[PDB]
Design a protein around this ligand. Structure first.
Ligand code: CDT
Ligand code: CDT
Ligand code: CDT
Ligand code: CDT
Lengths: 303, 303, 303, 303
């Protein structure tokens, strides 16, 4: 009947000193709890293996490199893949990727989709890098993603994951209608990803109290307008003196929030997903082929 | 100047036999009340001069033509333009446009922007036509816009209206991120329009209770993601046996609803608008030039 | 750790001709699915064994009586209690109760709490009966609850159900702050019930589009202000030509909706419940003993 | 008359050294702007004449006393009353009240209603005092209202203000259903007040991101369940190193937010108010006399 149970594994803070081994234990616990509640897939946060290091300015490259993965999975993360296969629960894992190509140390904010067999089905590299590239003194904490990562080079792909068409977004990406639309046009039935969203907005502090609103607004609108189920897993709580947004969620193709976290700690939420529900939108009010007039959208793709 | 007061003139039902003269009296009343409350611009509904005729299956061309405007403004509508100039309040008026080219009739669902001097400074023709194409017997009311109108041929332009950059959308258009984005890329500071949205949708009645939700979600998301003020003027109430959605609104560039109607009759709402507020989004989180990666949005413009 | 998994079993329509045996099959299916997802308790709708008969005017007492239960459980409903005990999942069941006392045929809109052992722990009889008492011609459908039931005679009790303090409300009750507050003062940790809420409001049709809003507003506010988890199970869909509201939900003590249904059919939703979370409100902003000034609330209890 | 235009005058921060003369200039500006937009009544914040001093632990009584009013109005505040009478616009003003009885000082967190003739027609003293009673070292700022004020002794009265029945609440009061209900039972058509709500709460920081949610939820629910129009005027912005909540609002008797502020500075919002709108709730779903069962609400009034 094209049904499944989707889960989101929200993470509480990860300390700068907290080891990957310790984080994996936490991820394994949520994956196991999710499976016990019938979930067939669980979405984890953006950069879920470390503290959100872009908040600091690094002068030592070796120290910066320590936060990146040079292989996926390595011996430390391996246990998560083995448990996923064992319990038949796939997952979306976010991490910092370091790959040397043509003499260049390429750094990406990455996420991978692993199926219920523990196999990596697809990868995505964050295209919309927020923040800044140089240290900015007026900020109480930095957001140097433009400095520590380069824009993704895989576009916005949609993969077949256990008979479900899934697309990935990473944090800031969720706020751009273009990311959602490209994946919607590729037939995505589920669009998921994670995020590290501070509740304080240094550039525009007058928007601080709207942090939850803007995050949920983006998820609801993206789902509705593309007739896609969506899920966002945040890493929340007070991490290294910076409060991060919670409200991890699962959203229906109608834009209705069907599951929402209420704590700022490791938390699992689940929701029954019917892939055919996408038709209520994609065959009617949002029947792309019948209603879209692309000859008028050219400006969106102009360089 | 960067400050102004925006108004929305929601309309109650317009009967099939209600004359344009009677409708103009109603529009004049709202425009006058809005100006008395400081407004310098008022947004009126889609097809604001007649009942929403696309709900019927027409068999007589003369009858169909009777609901269109062959000139703008004609002697009957002219008074609205004269009062707008007198009180210094521009407006957005929706109407059915009938044009004859070399003996060939062209039909559009149209809206025009009139400045505080009563001069027409811009036009837009509905690009996203919703509904079905043929008569469907099971429906309590039809929605045959695809038969009675041709998709707009003016694209999604943005016009200068009394020191404000304004873009127009018409009803269904508000649900498409592409419409909003094109105008956002053209620098729109205010994106406005009207709508006739039945609270019942024959093919997907399971979404009926979400009518307000979907309407407001579309306005809030469009405003936020484009850092634009927006306004939607609905024609609400029980019109010719079909209940139409109210909840006309004015929205800030943050996606915050700053004004909302609560009746289903002619109703004026206003809100103070600071055109520089758009910068809170467009120079920061949604600084297009600095964050967008159009090279990866090509699919959106593919025919 | 005072934790559990709460479920809501929303019902789709129940036809006037649909038998209790058929309804029980549907209830058993949801209870089983809920248990498979880890739930320890499931909330069912108000009058969950029959169609919402108050919508019709009855002239035959025998016909009216057919919709009431004279024993709970009887041989037909028995299977549900046996399965609850088997799988270790308690439930809240709503039904029409007919009891003869002192020569009077007493009729109540009732709900019972059954623990994970299949034992009836407590009963509640609807105190706030909405609608009217006499046939009213202007209505497209009636709501004769005042005619078919008498106000409950058990007050608003709170019972110990498997180590959780649970209070019950029935439909309309959820809109009255008094119902919530009495149970809050009695220490309720979970307040639950069901409802049959038409999306059309005959007395005030201008509120039709606010049906979901008012229902969710009532649940969120009640939970927040009493620091109680809550759950509302609706019977939704087109039942005997009357559309009933869906949006069954589970709400945290903060008023946050943690689970929401998206269909208008039989649907199970679940949420992890931590009873100690109530303390975040009841020991702080809503620390009753420290902040309430009952000497000023007398008017609320005046007859 | 049953029609009027209600306004809310949100205040930006008031510095510790900012004089009442300077504050009155700011209040006069908003009152004048509101009247120019047709308003006949404007709601100002709680303790609208000074910085929110309860955030400090005082050690000098003279210093504490300096933040209170010993007369209302004194020569410095009188101009506001004179302008209100001149322009025909009443107001709700919050202030700290110091009364001396037989040499004994009485302190209240107070608000008064002034009609369009500039006459004081009603007073209310905050009954629900939030916060803590002793100095708590870990807090970045205190909230010692329980020490600086005595619970109000006037109950929750409802006054006639220019043909409108108005009731007052002060800040925290808006979160208690009892406050709203008493005024609802007294026939209030408009329930209004102001607030100083930090977006950070030291003892329960996990609710910080819900500050707007909880504030609006309280206003919407109170209005709906009592069929009353309501208005909340906040003093927002970064005041003495503490960020205060904005989102000042005007709400319809249906719980619908009809106007909302979007800045954290002095800001005026207005909305058309029809006093007969209250009937949509109070003569139907919330027809108190016909539906309430006070005999079962006794616990709410128990001391
Ligand atoms: C600096 S923009 C706001 C924060 C951003 N966070 C991430 N990780 O992308 C986000 O869009 O969620
Ligand atoms: C038939 S689709 C839903 C109704 C549509 N109305 C108009 N007028 O475009 C709208 O998008 O608002
Ligand atoms: C007639 S009042 C609106 C409908 C009412 N329904 C029930 N069952 O109580 C409710 O309050 O949900
Ligand atoms: C300390 S409780 C939260 C803050 C409180 N503020 C005031 N001024 O009452 C309020 O209820 O808005």
């Amino acid at each position: 009947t094209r049904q499944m149970i989707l889960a989101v594994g929200q993470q509480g803070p990860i300390a700068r000193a907290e080891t990957r081994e310790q984080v994996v234990v936490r991820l394994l616990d949520m994956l196991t709890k999710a499976a016990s509640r019938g979930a067939n897939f669980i979405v984890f946060p953006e950069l879920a293996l470390t503290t959100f290091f872009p908040r600091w300015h690094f002068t030592d490259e070796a120290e910066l490199d320590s936060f990146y993965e040079t292989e996926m999975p390595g011996p430390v993360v391996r246990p998560l893949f083995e448990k996923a296969a064992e319990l038949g629960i796939g997952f979306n894992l976010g991490y910092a990727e370091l790959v040397v190509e043509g003499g260049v140390k390429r750094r990406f904010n990455t996420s991978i989709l692993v199926d219920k067999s523990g196999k990596i089905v697809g990868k995505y590299r964050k295209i919309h890098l927020p923040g800044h590239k140089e240290y900015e003194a007026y900020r109480p904490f930095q957001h140097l993603e433009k400095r520590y990562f380069e824009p993704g080079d895989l576009g916005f792909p949609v993969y077949d994951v256990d008979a479900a068409k899934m697309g990935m977004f990473i944090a800031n990406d969720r706020r751009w209608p273009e990311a959602w639309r490209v994946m919607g046009l590729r037939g995505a039935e589920i669009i998921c990803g994670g995020y590290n969203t501070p509740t304080h907005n240094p550039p525009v502090p007058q928007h601080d109290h709207l942090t939850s609103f803007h995050h949920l607004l983006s998820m609801q609108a993206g789902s509705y307008q593309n007739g896609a189920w969506s899920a966002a897993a945040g890493k929340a709580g007070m991490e290294e003196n910076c409060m991060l947004l919670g409200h991890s969620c699962i959203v229906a193709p109608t834009g209705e929030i069907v599951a929402l976290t209420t704590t700022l700690e490791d938390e699992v939420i689940t929701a029954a997903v019917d892939l055919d529900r996408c038709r209520e939108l994609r065959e009617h009010i949002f029947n792309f082929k019948q209603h879209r007039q692309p000859q008028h959208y050219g400006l969106i793709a102009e360089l």
